[PDB]
Amino acid sequence: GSIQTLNLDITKVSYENGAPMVTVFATNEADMPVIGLANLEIKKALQLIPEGATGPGNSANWQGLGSSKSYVDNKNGSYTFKFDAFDSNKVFNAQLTQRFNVVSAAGKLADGTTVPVAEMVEDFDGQGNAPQYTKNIVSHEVCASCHVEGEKIYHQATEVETCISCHTQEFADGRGKPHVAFSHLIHNVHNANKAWGKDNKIPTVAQNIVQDNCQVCHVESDMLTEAKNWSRIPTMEVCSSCHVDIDFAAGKGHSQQLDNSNCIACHNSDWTAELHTAKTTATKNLINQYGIETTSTINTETKAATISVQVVDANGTAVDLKTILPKVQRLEIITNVGPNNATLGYSGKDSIFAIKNGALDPKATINDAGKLVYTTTKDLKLGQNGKDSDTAFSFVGWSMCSSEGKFVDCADPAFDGVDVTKYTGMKADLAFATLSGKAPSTRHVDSVNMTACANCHTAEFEIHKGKQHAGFVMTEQLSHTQDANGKAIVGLDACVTCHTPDGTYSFANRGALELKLHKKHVEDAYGLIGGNCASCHSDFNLESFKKKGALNTAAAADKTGLYSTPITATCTTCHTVGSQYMVHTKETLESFGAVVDGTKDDATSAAQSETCFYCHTPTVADHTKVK
Ligand code: HEC
Ligand code: HEC
Ligand code: HEC
Ligand code: HEC
Ligand code: HEC
Ligand code: HEC
Ligand code: HEC
Ligand code: HEC
Ligand code: HEC
Ligand code: HEC
Ligand SMILES: [Ca+2]
Ligand SMILES: [Ca+2]
Ligand SMILES: [Ca+2]
Ligand SMILES: [Ca+2]
Ligand SMILES: [Ca+2]
């Protein structure tokens, strides 16, 4: 017995007896009543002191009225709370909006049915009718873009409204700690200008992900009538969470301000909203000014691929590349072979910077039709490794020089790409070609896609922008299939051009794409992801292992490559053999057909000999499932 989702509604609030009597209705994912909840609670009862009541320009705030774990299970899905000690500070005011924060802890019903955590708030007027005014600024869904939904965020609770209901202005005042008011704390813990906590944690990682982008949490919504408060209510308490060097009382770094009465007179909402979003808006506008459309063909006699790139404008209209060439900062073409199991490796891939800082490489030209044309020079080895190897696949990344939201000429031929404020990575593309002339093979893209990456990195993620690459922006330009609803899938299959079964530049980095995203995020994003495979995966494509060969998993002492059979390679990125994270010894893994950090020849010969999926039946919901 398992409940997938526990829904909670406050269906009745009655003050006929003084202390409100509060009824909660609980249903499962099929809208059936849930009877026997043992850990239901009113975590907080609050009422809303309105905007400006504590002083001109001051925020609305939640005043505390108590809590209750005293309830009767009415045996029909409803539960009725009473308060043994309502409003112990005697501040109740029926003219104020009243809020109740209700939580149900994860656990089991008596019959043993598992029940997940549930949290909610609901607002009322002082007689239990609908409220007359609210403080609805954000909703819990924004946090779930980056923090695993249903798991605690730092501590105490899983939904932001529960945090807000405890981390109130009253709470902070009572502790003498302004910074623990939630509207200060929330920005503090994602911004690196000052540390937080007794251990003085500098939020370097949070800063690098959030980048002070107000729109990842402050989102327009008809559901949230105070959503524009992030620009409409400037206060020293909130604005100082990132602006940590101003002393408004002493007038250092800013004119003296003794209260919040005049902030809005100067910091008008238009300005605050615009200035904090200007650069991401400008960059997004530049990215969407141009596109590219790429084709590739194989010469059947020379077996080389010729890649042709058509620049287009925002409407899809052709743009002769000669007209914008002086502003093209880089354009790179990387070609590998065998999209389901790349065959050329990292050293054997074809790659060129066809353009650098306005200059065409001698190996690339612009034809009379205005297209860039380049022909591969490395041995593509087409058709030498089975049918999949009939297909070459080419990844095109490019960037354009830019300053303050405008494209500009690349005036410096030697510009090294380190200063990312001087250029914009643009929409990348992917082109297939076959030696036979038959339709190309393509890699599966049905298990991970860019929408998941964009939840944390935004859709404008300029992947690898810097000294080494132009920056790959991933979009429907390189989509070649749709999901069951007809939405174009933006895959990461182009990344395999470099993230090959042989690894990347070193054999020691688990560079194969099947390994690399796991390695980076289990090492550096575990606080956000943990074992939550759904953070990237809609499914696992276990059938894809039948198209895989050996995967590079280590470097030998002499720096040559060591390889594993592909399921073992994929699981061991997070489950290192010989570590506390892997119960199977090397010997046992070999008894299941695996090769573990052996030669490419041995791992290749044994690549379809692994018996792991006889026992293991992983799903995204539970990847640990075994028979
Ligand atoms: C992606 C753009 C995020 C959004 C949206 C939210 N959070 Fe966040 N948060 C993010 C990162 C990358 C980090 C650093 C993690 C690390 O391991 O260093 C954080 C950190 C926090 C913290 C600090 C404590 C911690 O768990 O590390 C808190 C308290 C926190 N985040 C809360 C939080 C809330 C309530 C959000 C919705 C309003 C929210 N975050 C959104 C990334 C992102
Ligand atoms: C009361 C029922 C709480 C709930 C709900 C939430 N938090 Fe909390 N938090 C609470 C206390 C008593 C404290 C210690 C405050 C102090 O005096 O130092 C905290 C502290 C934090 C912090 C540390 C802030 C800092 O040191 O600057 C963070 C980052 C934090 N809490 C986050 C947080 C989140 C994200 C919550 C909702 C998921 C949340 N808290 C709820 C009490 C309560
Ligand atoms: C998620 C990690 C956030 C980011 C990024 C930014 N804000 Fe935020 N803000 C967030 C929360 C959860 C809250 C509390 C809402 C509540 O109901 O209490 C806030 C609050 C503010 C406020 C206070 C508004 C008020 O009525 O007093 C302001 C002025 C504000 N936030 C501004 C702001 C700006 C300018 C940001 C980008 C630079 C920004 N926030 C980012 C969550 C997050
Ligand atoms: C962290 C999430 C922030 C919060 C909260 C607030 N601001 Fe901010 N501010 C932040 C950044 C990253 C920047 C630089 C933006 C850029 O692209 O250059 C700013 C900048 C300003 C400025 C202009 C700079 C100056 O020297 O004056 C102003 C006037 C400003 N911010 C005001 C402001 C107000 C009024 C805030 C509370 C509503 C506020 N900031 C919060 C980051 C963050
Ligand atoms: C008019 C007399 C103002 C009053 C009243 C308030 N602010 Fe201000 N502020 C004002 C200016 C002209 C600037 C510089 C703008 C620029 O782009 O250079 C600022 C700056 C700030 C900042 C940013 C600080 C920084 O990043 O260096 C913040 C966060 C800020 N101001 C907040 C703020 C608050 C909270 C106010 C009321 C207490 C307030 N300002 C009043 C002009 C004026
Ligand atoms: C939130 C749960 C994330 C998901 C979903 C994705 N990524 Fe991620 N990524 C995340 C964090 C916290 C970090 C560490 C950042 C730091 O400052 O240490 C990363 C790191 C990367 C990087 C490194 C480059 C960088 O800009 O930091 C890359 C190239 C990267 N992530 C790619 C990526 C891909 C392709 C994703 C979809 C499969 C993806 N990320 C999802 C957080 C999260
Ligand atoms: C060759 C031109 C590459 C392309 C195309 C892609 N990546 Fe890459 N990546 C490349 C190298 C040489 C390295 C360093 C060595 C290593 O294997 O770690 C990387 C690294 C990463 C990482 C690790 C974190 C980091 O260094 O940024 C990640 C998460 C990563 N690469 C992801 C990634 C994605 C999602 C790609 C397609 C959009 C992609 N890379 C393409 C070289 C090349
Ligand atoms: C984003 C940071 C990821 C998280 C979190 C997890 N996985 Fe993943 N996985 C990711 C990528 C980019 C790929 C490569 C896709 C490709 O084209 O090669 C994979 C691949 C797998 C596979 C192979 C089968 C497939 O669907 O392609 C497996 C079996 C797999 N991943 C398992 C897995 C598990 C069990 C995770 C939770 C512990 C998990 N992944 C998280 C990206 C990310
Ligand atoms: C990182 C992206 C992982 C990948 C790839 C795989 N697993 Fe995993 N696994 C991961 C975590 C973070 C955890 C939880 C560890 C904890 O104690 O919290 C697990 C756990 C398991 C388990 C259960 C633990 C045990 O001792 O058996 C199993 C059975 C398991 N994982 C299997 C498994 C398989 C078969 C994988 C390849 C298909 C695989 N995991 C990949 C993280 C990651
Ligand atoms: C049945 C005889 C199995 C075979 C065949 C394979 N595995 Fe297994 N595995 C099995 C069990 C009973 C467990 C423990 C489950 C638990 O919840 O305790 C595991 C565990 C793993 C793990 C997690 C290890 C850990 O977290 O310490 C991994 C990563 C794993 N197994 C991988 C794996 C591989 C790669 C296999 C084929 C070579 C394989 N298993 C086969 C049972 C069985
Ligand atoms: Ca209701
Ligand atoms: Ca909820
Ligand atoms: Ca901080
Ligand atoms: Ca295309
Ligand atoms: Ca077999």
Residue numbers in the entry: 44 to 670
What does the paper say about this structure?
Thus, we investigated whether amber suppression in MR-1 could produce ncAA-containing MHCs and, specifically, variants of the MtrC protein, which contains ten c-type hemes.
The structure of wtMtrC was inspected to identify surface residues that might be changed to ncAAs with limited effect on the MtrC structure. Residue A293 in Domain II and E344 and A430 in Domain III were chosen, Figure 2C. Thus, site-specific replacement of MtrC surface residues with BocK has no discernible impact on the protein structure. By contrast, there was no detectable FMN reduction for ΔmtrC/omcA MR-1 cells cultured in the absence of wtMtrC. Thus, our results indicate that MtrC344BocK and MtrC430BocK retain the structure and redox activity of wtMtrC. A crystal structure of the homologous MtrCAB complex purified from Shewanella baltica OS18542 shows that MtrC Domain III, which contains residues 344 and 430, makes no contribution to the binding with MtrAB. This is consistent with the ability of wtMtrC, MtrC344BocK, and MtrC430BocK to restore FMN reduction activity to ΔmtrC/omcA MR-1 cells by associating with MtrAB in the outer membrane.
